[PDB]
């Protein structure tokens, strides 16, 4: 299968440089060009540039001065680098491949890399149980969750029971607290009869801080 | 560069209905237009290339038409999994440019929220902060009010709400209201109540606990 996997999300200090690695499979960098597109609140989808099969590069006009794209064919890697980032360069960055070698119809995308441009510090979250009780159990259904609190920057990924539990899961959008740190909750509803037999674990991962926490959530 | 104007900004339709998206270009671009779908937390997915040409693996209900400046992406019978934003892209003129997107919301029948309340964990209390969480689960439509009360005092300005995007299966929203207090303030009070108002409830529903039991 054709795939593009990007390096993890993170913080970059203002006026510093951004580096992303795109690793491809299911095709050869010698046969296809790889494009870079970003997506931001202020400017939406922007095409940034491309490295072609034979190594030539094109950069979108406002980016020629601060953008470099390189690759290693043998290692199937494409290297994106942008200089002197400012706040409004905060965006999701994607690598992408077209349907045909010369074209721009983007049929294959990387998973995106959230880049936050900020002077602040990376901080991992604390994870707190949102325990089920009778004040969270009606008609045989119990609600339980995890409070993922005080991290920076976005994103944090949350899953349940190592991926095995997805049905009835809601992971809320993060909210910025006055502290300038993010917080969110992830909940799930389950049969209350299962609280005595099944274990419920939220798996939390904050890649920018390399913080991985598994929080067991039990009825209190 | 070519300016692509997408209209309208939001579309709201019922399942089973046809729906069309408009993409207008600032000068003629032949048929050099591609369309993409973006779902919650996703990367764009290519739907249609060159105005009308199909893409492998894309359901037949998606099609596109148009030439010159006026272009249309259509879905002949909308399903809940179609909840997403939709973008056009032109590539008749370097550099390739995208429109600002159209949002697709789905209508459905009114659904009352299930309300759950969670006291702060003793774990969190060790850090000197207390979060009290109120969950409004699987409701429609999106409008809801959450009122917090501590010992019958109205809480104002010390809570934050987050709301999910529409669920791709049942079209409902869920909402979390988090009330945040210092450990000191939390220990000085007893009754914590979350009151929920919604179109699907004949009366406001209140969930509460006493600190302890």
């Amino acid at each position: 299968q054709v795939q593009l996997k990007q390096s993890g999300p993170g913080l970059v200090q203002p006026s510093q440089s951004l580096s992303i690695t795109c690793t491809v499979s299911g095709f050869s960098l010698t046969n296809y060009g790889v494009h870079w597109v970003r997506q931001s609140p202020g400017k939406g989808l922007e095409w940034l540039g491309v490295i072609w099969s034979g190594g030539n590069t094109d950069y979108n006009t406002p980016f020629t001065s601060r953008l470099s794209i390189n690759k290693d064919n043998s290692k199937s890697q494409v290297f994106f680098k942008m200089n002197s980032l400012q706040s409004n360069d905060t965006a999701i960055y994607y690598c992408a491949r077209a349907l045909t070698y010369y074209d721009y119809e983007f049929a294959y995308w990387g998973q995106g890399t959230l880049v936050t441009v900020s002077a602040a510090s990376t901080k991992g979250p604390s994870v707190f149980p949102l325990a089920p009780s009778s004040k969270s159990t009606s008609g045989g259904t119990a609600a339980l969750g995890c409070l993922v609190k005080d991290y920076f920057p976005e994103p944090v990924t949350v899953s349940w029971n190592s991926g095995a539990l997805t049905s009835g899961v809601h992971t809320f959008p993060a909210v910025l607290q006055s502290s300038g740190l993010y917080s969110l909750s992830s909940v799930v509803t389950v049969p209350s009869s299962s609280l005595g037999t099944q274990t419920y674990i939220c798996n939390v991962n904050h890649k920018p801080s390399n913080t991985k926490v598994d929080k067991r959530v039990e009825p209190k | 560069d070519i300016l692509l104007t997408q209209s309208p900004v939001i579309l709201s339709v019922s399942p089973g209905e046809r729906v069309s998206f408009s993409c207008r270009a600032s000068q003629s671009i032949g048929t050099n237009i591609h369309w993409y779908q973006q779902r919650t937390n996703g990367s764009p997915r290519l739907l249609i290339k060159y105005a009308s040409e199909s893409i492998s693996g894309i359901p037949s209900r998606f099609s596109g038409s148009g030439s010159g400046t006026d272009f249309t992406l259509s879905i002949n019978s909308v399903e809940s999994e179609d909840i997403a934003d939709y973008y056009c892209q032109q590539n008749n003129n370097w550099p390739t440019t995208f429109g600002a997107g159209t949002k697709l919301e789905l209508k459905r029948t009114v659904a009352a929220p299930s309300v759950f309340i969670f006291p702060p964990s003793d774990e969190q209390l060790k850090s000197g902060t207390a979060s009290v969480v109120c969950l409004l689960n699987n409701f429609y439509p999106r409008e809801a009010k959450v009122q917090w009360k501590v010992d019958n005092a109205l809480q104002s300005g010390n809570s934050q709400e987050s709301v999910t995007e529409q669920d791709s299966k049942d079209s409902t929203y869920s909402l979390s209201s988090t009330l945040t207090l210092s450990k000191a303030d939390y220990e000085k009070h007893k009754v914590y109540a979350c009151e929920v108002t919604h179109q699907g409830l004949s009366s406001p529903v209140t969930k509460s606990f006493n600190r302890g039991a």
């Binding site: 609140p41 999701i92 976005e154 993060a174 | 973006q38 995007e165």
Partner: peptide, 12 residues
């Protein structure tokens, strides 16, 4: 509407 980095969705 504006694109939201948290949800990758348009927020209006």
């Amino acid at each position: 509407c504006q694109f939201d980095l948290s949800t990758r969705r348009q927020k209006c």
